[PDB]
Amino acid sequence: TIKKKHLDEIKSLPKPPTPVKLAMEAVCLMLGGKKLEWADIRKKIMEPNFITSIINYDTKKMMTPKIREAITKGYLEDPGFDYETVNRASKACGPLVKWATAQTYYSE
Amino acid sequence: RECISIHVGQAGVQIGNACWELYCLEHGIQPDGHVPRAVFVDLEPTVIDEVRTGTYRQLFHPEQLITGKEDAANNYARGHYTIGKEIIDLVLDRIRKLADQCTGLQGFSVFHSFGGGTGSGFTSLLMERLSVDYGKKSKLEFSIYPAPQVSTAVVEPYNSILTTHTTLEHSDCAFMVDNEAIYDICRRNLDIERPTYTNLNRLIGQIVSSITASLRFDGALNVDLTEFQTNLVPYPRGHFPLATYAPVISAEKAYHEQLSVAEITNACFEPANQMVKCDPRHGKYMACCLLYRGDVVPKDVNAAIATIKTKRTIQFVDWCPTGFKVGINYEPPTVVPGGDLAKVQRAVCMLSNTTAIAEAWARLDHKFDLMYAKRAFVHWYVGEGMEEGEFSEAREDMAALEKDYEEVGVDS
Amino acid sequence: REIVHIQAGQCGNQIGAKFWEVISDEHGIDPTGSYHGDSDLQLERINVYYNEAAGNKYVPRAILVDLEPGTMDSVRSGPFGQIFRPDNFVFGQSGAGNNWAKGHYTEGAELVDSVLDVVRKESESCDCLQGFQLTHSLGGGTGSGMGTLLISKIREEYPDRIMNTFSVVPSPKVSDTVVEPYNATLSVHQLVENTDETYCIDNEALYDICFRTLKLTTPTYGDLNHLVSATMSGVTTCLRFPGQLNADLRKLAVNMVPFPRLHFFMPGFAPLTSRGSQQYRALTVPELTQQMFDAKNMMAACDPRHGRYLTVAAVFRGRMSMKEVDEQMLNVQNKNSSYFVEWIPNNVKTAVCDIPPRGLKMSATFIGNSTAIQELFKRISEQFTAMFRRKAFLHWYTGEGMDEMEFTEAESNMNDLVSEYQQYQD
Ligand SMILES: CC(=O)O[C@H]1C(=O)[C@@]2(C)[C@H]([C@H](OC(=O)c3ccccc3)[C@]3(O)C[C@H](OC(=O)[C@H](O)[C@@H](NC(=O)c4ccccc4)c4ccccc4)C(C)=C1C3(C)C)[C@]1(OC(C)=O)CO[C@@H]1C[C@@H]2O
Ligand SMILES: Nc1nc2c(ncn2[C@@H]2O[C@H](COP(=O)(O)OP(=O)(O)OP(=O)(O)O)[C@@H](O)[C@H]2O)c(=O)[nH]1
Ligand SMILES: Nc1nc2c(ncn2[C@@H]2O[C@H](COP(=O)(O)OP(=O)(O)O)[C@@H](O)[C@H]2O)c(=O)[nH]1
Ligand SMILES: [Mg+2]
């Protein structure tokens, strides 16, 4: 699957570029990380479930009401949250942006 | 009137050690006399603590020295940005705080080594801030720049480019002296196989002593700091002269030492004694300040330059009809009593911006790319963050430098 | 900066006794002890290792983790022994279990939180935290397993701060454990992600070095442990000591590691002469350089000939010329252009420290990064599959409540980790 090279790059970074971190918070947030905090994310970030778990997302598992709207809210709408700037952030992230507007949009 | 120096980085500190140490000898202000010009700043506590424990303990005020328990890191990223920021507030407040008291500061001669995270990184912002704030002031930076082969740090070329890039607009004039380059002076000229870092710093000690100490000290020619940039630098970058000392002659072994003005001045030009790797292969000489202390007769000087001008291997750039700035200081160079130094009656220091550095920058520049393409260590940098970002964008900027340097010479 | 030591696993603990054995002396601490310290200086930095409860008492700040009561007890009952704070020991009577699986999941898991409690307490203690040290063996259930797990929580809790590792990578020729592929592979799997800096030591390599390099007829474990303790001390404590050019851990991390793997290094001590005759007094510089660089006297199994260096860091501690040290290296570099590796312009990171190992004049620790190690990794994995495919031992693990996939995953990760190394090599 996705090469590790991308993953560690973000993680090891003691303090990631802020919007990246914010993005990670967002993505983790899509994951629904309860914790604000880094560390809880951090150990989460490297975990055996993590590597696959992102890659395949069971639709049923994801829950519409809260989860749908925040993402839908225009976090994307955000003034620079969205695809283009984020895409600058990484090669890796880029395929993800497509994912955001994707099956999720189509089915729903 | 006065200038305040700041020493940063461990290395800048260790020079910081030297620069003051030489000073005290000259002035004759023993261990416990007046109060220092300058402050020292290091992210790594131990080294500064060396100052704290070590020689000239009382002389500095603890207010003067700035430190952090926190980690230096050998990388531009933390030192500049991340760890970086926290210290600066204290730093700047210090400089202003010091600045306030003095009357009519000419500017600060900041010392740093290219050279490391705190030397890079941390300093780069520091000068960065200065330009806005002080602005009117003249900002020279004294740098020690990576030995061509030698460089200790793995990371190093990453640091330097960013440092040079960032500071470049900011600094009025920056002096660069090469570590291994000096070594050759040691090896051949004094013949020390041994020499420690302390030795080199002593050497720089002497050279610096001319620029700040002696010049400000009244003397026949009297050169200002401001003149330094004005005469020295053709152009809005930033330009980095090299610094040379004729009298390097070994203390014990050989006593020609009465080498009158003609010979001593003559000594510098030869590529050997640059304290820079540069060894002007092609290099054109835009401009020089020669500052002499000792017994000099200006006729002796004036004649001396004239012959030099003519020999025409030297080949100055066309656009400068002439660019020789004589400076004469009454009082002879002062040699640190024991250790190495020759203690010549008269000495020459001469700085210049030469085309030659373009060679150095290119080499320096080359180092950067090799790692960079693989991208190397960068993950460390990005983590400190830093972004792809600064590296490449900076990379281009200094690339501009190479063009800039090249264009200046080689064409008429 | 402060550093906290970790001892996990018997090997684990055994080395820990030695490590502190030297270190205590290096600092000048007697068993309950205080700073008898010949010099003043040693006193100042000490804080990295120790906390100041008594004023007399500086007690090393580190934790002992071991299912085996016997191992720990001997250490307590042993010489230095008493020095440790009893709190430090985190123990579990439960069967040590050879199983990595036992250590990690089943047996280890319960203890770990208890373990973590203290780690934090030491962590919390004061000043700033450089990071943690680790010793253990890939080894066994306690050595790996728990220890490998322990780092995991450490990684999470304080990501910023650095972990260096010492692992006794399984000795090639005859493995001191039957299980050897299983425990080792999975354990390294954790580190490669987890610990930012790792050091490997190999026993036979120690034997080889001890036996040739030192006249020493009868290597004892206490010997190998002792020599090993030698390198790390140069690494950690030395730089805490002043130096004209002194790196610290982060310098070691930054300069040394090109890529995120954290990679693994092989320690190598500068002085290694017999008691005895060998005392040449050819320390000068170059003799040191020759020693470390040379193929043997490399702590880990692999030989640099094989063999290219991503990075080298030499922390010399002793008063030597900057001129010679820096200059000498270059010739080494030029001389061995083939292996060094072209891209990174100045391979060697040089650290100089003023003060030598308290007995001796001039020594450099040699640390760092080479492609060669990859050869080592193949060994473990190669054993791994031969074992794995047949699955001989496995039931113990799985009965313990381990996954089939887990085995496969661990191997491949380290396995391809080997693959990563080669890429640079070419
Ligand atoms: C009379 C004299 O000069 O004796 C020397 C000596 O003969 C030699 C042979 C020592 C000796 O070391 C060994 O024989 C040895 C035994 C087991 C494993 C490894 C080495 C020595 O035992 C070791 C001892 O080392 C130290 O004192 C260092 O500070 C060292 N200390 C320890 O390892 C240590 C040992 C016991 C208890 C506590 C600490 C050290 C090195 C690096 C970082 C920190 C500390 C020294 C110089 C000597 C003796 C005493 C004979 C040598 O080793 C070291 C590490 O210095 C072996 O080759 C070197 C060259 C030395 O000259
Ligand atoms: N002339 C001279 N050069 C020095 C001295 N100390 C260090 N250097 C050189 O400067 C560079 C070393 O920088 P470091 O000491 O690693 O780092 P630093 O710039 O102090 O800052 P950090 O990386 O954060 O520690 C190398 O190129 C050394 O050769 C010194 O006392 N004199
Ligand atoms: N250098 C060294 N290796 C050791 C020591 N003790 C055990 N080992 C090595 O560790 C491996 C065995 O693992 P072990 O430490 O018994 O595992 P655990 O105790 O169950 O965690 C073998 O490869 C041994 O050579 C020691 O004191 N020093
Ligand atoms: Mg430093």
PDB file of C-alpha atoms and ligand atoms in Angstrom, chain C residues 8-16 18 65-68 71 96-100 136-147 168-171 174-177 180 183 201-204 206-207 220-228, ligand 3:
ATOM      1  CA  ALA C   8      14.304  -4.340  29.835  1.00  0.00           C
ATOM      2  CA  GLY C   9      14.858  -8.028  29.657  1.00  0.00           C
ATOM      3  CA  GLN C  10      17.563  -9.923  31.529  1.00  0.00           C
ATOM      4  CA  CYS C  11      20.240  -9.042  29.032  1.00  0.00           C
ATOM      5  CA  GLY C  12      18.349  -6.141  29.522  1.00  0.00           C
ATOM      6  CA  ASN C  13      19.237  -5.831  33.182  1.00  0.00           C
ATOM      7  CA  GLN C  14      22.597  -7.645  33.007  1.00  0.00           C
ATOM      8  CA  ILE C  15      24.110  -4.921  30.857  1.00  0.00           C
ATOM      9  CA  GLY C  16      22.344  -2.299  32.863  1.00  0.00           C
ATOM     10  CA  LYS C  18      27.511  -2.944  33.923  1.00  0.00           C
ATOM     11  CA  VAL C  65      11.957  -4.056  33.721  1.00  0.00           C
ATOM     12  CA  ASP C  66      12.034  -7.788  34.002  1.00  0.00           C
ATOM     13  CA  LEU C  67       9.618 -10.636  34.453  1.00  0.00           C
ATOM     14  CA  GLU C  68      12.481 -12.648  35.834  1.00  0.00           C
ATOM     15  CA  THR C  71      17.905 -11.646  37.089  1.00  0.00           C
ATOM     16  CA  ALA C  96       9.295 -14.843  32.247  1.00  0.00           C
ATOM     17  CA  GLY C  97       8.295 -16.681  29.141  1.00  0.00           C
ATOM     18  CA  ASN C  98      10.763 -16.995  26.343  1.00  0.00           C
ATOM     19  CA  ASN C  99       7.992 -15.857  24.077  1.00  0.00           C
ATOM     20  CA  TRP C 100       8.221 -12.440  22.567  1.00  0.00           C
ATOM     21  CA  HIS C 136      17.695  -5.301  25.737  1.00  0.00           C
ATOM     22  CA  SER C 137      17.969  -8.289  23.506  1.00  0.00           C
ATOM     23  CA  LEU C 138      15.926  -8.972  20.420  1.00  0.00           C
ATOM     24  CA  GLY C 139      16.569 -11.451  22.585  1.00  0.00           C
ATOM     25  CA  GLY C 140      13.661 -12.890  24.472  1.00  0.00           C
ATOM     26  CA  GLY C 141      10.206 -12.319  25.817  1.00  0.00           C
ATOM     27  CA  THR C 142      11.226  -9.706  28.371  1.00  0.00           C
ATOM     28  CA  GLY C 143      14.101  -8.351  26.262  1.00  0.00           C
ATOM     29  CA  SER C 144      11.974  -7.670  23.280  1.00  0.00           C
ATOM     30  CA  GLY C 145       8.295  -8.089  23.715  1.00  0.00           C
ATOM     31  CA  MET C 146       7.771  -5.941  26.751  1.00  0.00           C
ATOM     32  CA  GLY C 147      10.790  -3.795  26.085  1.00  0.00           C
ATOM     33  CA  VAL C 168      21.952  -7.238  21.071  1.00  0.00           C
ATOM     34  CA  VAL C 169      21.171  -8.447  17.605  1.00  0.00           C
ATOM     35  CA  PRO C 170      21.169 -12.151  17.462  1.00  0.00           C
ATOM     36  CA  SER C 171      24.646 -13.531  17.069  1.00  0.00           C
ATOM     37  CA  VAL C 174      25.272 -19.967  16.898  1.00  0.00           C
ATOM     38  CA  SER C 175      22.222 -18.423  18.373  1.00  0.00           C
ATOM     39  CA  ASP C 176      22.008 -18.374  22.111  1.00  0.00           C
ATOM     40  CA  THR C 177      18.300 -18.924  21.740  1.00  0.00           C
ATOM     41  CA  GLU C 180      16.017 -16.478  17.766  1.00  0.00           C
ATOM     42  CA  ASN C 183      11.724 -12.797  18.911  1.00  0.00           C
ATOM     43  CA  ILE C 201      25.660  -4.914  19.633  1.00  0.00           C
ATOM     44  CA  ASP C 202      26.419  -8.486  18.835  1.00  0.00           C
ATOM     45  CA  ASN C 203      27.837 -10.971  21.320  1.00  0.00           C
ATOM     46  CA  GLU C 204      30.027 -12.958  19.002  1.00  0.00           C
ATOM     47  CA  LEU C 206      32.134  -8.844  21.031  1.00  0.00           C
ATOM     48  CA  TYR C 207      33.828 -12.169  21.433  1.00  0.00           C
ATOM     49  CA  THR C 220      33.186 -13.513  30.222  1.00  0.00           C
ATOM     50  CA  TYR C 221      29.820 -11.954  29.645  1.00  0.00           C
ATOM     51  CA  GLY C 222      30.773  -9.295  32.215  1.00  0.00           C
ATOM     52  CA  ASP C 223      33.544  -8.468  29.788  1.00  0.00           C
ATOM     53  CA  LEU C 224      31.362  -8.045  26.685  1.00  0.00           C
ATOM     54  CA  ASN C 225      28.815  -6.094  28.624  1.00  0.00           C
ATOM     55  CA  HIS C 226      31.671  -3.935  29.987  1.00  0.00           C
ATOM     56  CA  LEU C 227      33.076  -3.182  26.534  1.00  0.00           C
ATOM     57  CA  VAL C 228      29.631  -2.403  25.276  1.00  0.00           C
TER      58      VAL C 228
HETATM   59  N1  LIG D   3      26.123  -9.015  25.673  1.00  0.00           N
HETATM   60  C1  LIG D   3      25.218  -9.758  26.271  1.00  0.00           C
HETATM   61  N2  LIG D   3      24.323 -10.533  25.815  1.00  0.00           N
HETATM   62  C2  LIG D   3      23.508 -11.177  26.673  1.00  0.00           C
HETATM   63  C3  LIG D   3      23.544 -11.156  28.126  1.00  0.00           C
HETATM   64  N3  LIG D   3      22.566 -11.975  28.497  1.00  0.00           N
HETATM   65  C4  LIG D   3      21.788 -12.644  27.535  1.00  0.00           C
HETATM   66  N4  LIG D   3      22.522 -12.028  26.379  1.00  0.00           N
HETATM   67  C5  LIG D   3      22.114 -12.363  25.015  1.00  0.00           C
HETATM   68  O1  LIG D   3      20.626 -12.257  24.946  1.00  0.00           O
HETATM   69  C6  LIG D   3      19.981 -13.334  24.159  1.00  0.00           C
HETATM   70  C7  LIG D   3      19.033 -14.028  25.016  1.00  0.00           C
HETATM   71  O2  LIG D   3      17.916 -13.214  25.483  1.00  0.00           O
HETATM   72  P1  LIG D   3      17.641 -13.016  26.999  1.00  0.00           P
HETATM   73  O3  LIG D   3      18.398 -11.823  27.468  1.00  0.00           O
HETATM   74  O4  LIG D   3      17.789 -14.263  27.856  1.00  0.00           O
HETATM   75  O5  LIG D   3      16.008 -12.655  26.984  1.00  0.00           O
HETATM   76  P2  LIG D   3      15.029 -12.336  28.175  1.00  0.00           P
HETATM   77  O6  LIG D   3      15.826 -12.433  29.320  1.00  0.00           O
HETATM   78  O7  LIG D   3      13.819 -13.432  28.114  1.00  0.00           O
HETATM   79  O8  LIG D   3      14.463 -11.003  27.891  1.00  0.00           O
HETATM   80  C8  LIG D   3      21.228 -14.180  23.713  1.00  0.00           C
HETATM   81  O9  LIG D   3      21.510 -13.779  22.324  1.00  0.00           O
HETATM   82  C9  LIG D   3      22.444 -13.792  24.587  1.00  0.00           C
HETATM   83  O10 LIG D   3      23.761 -13.831  24.011  1.00  0.00           O
HETATM   84  C10 LIG D   3      24.576 -10.295  28.560  1.00  0.00           C
HETATM   85  O11 LIG D   3      24.709 -10.155  29.890  1.00  0.00           O
HETATM   86  N5  LIG D   3      25.393  -9.598  27.738  1.00  0.00           N
END
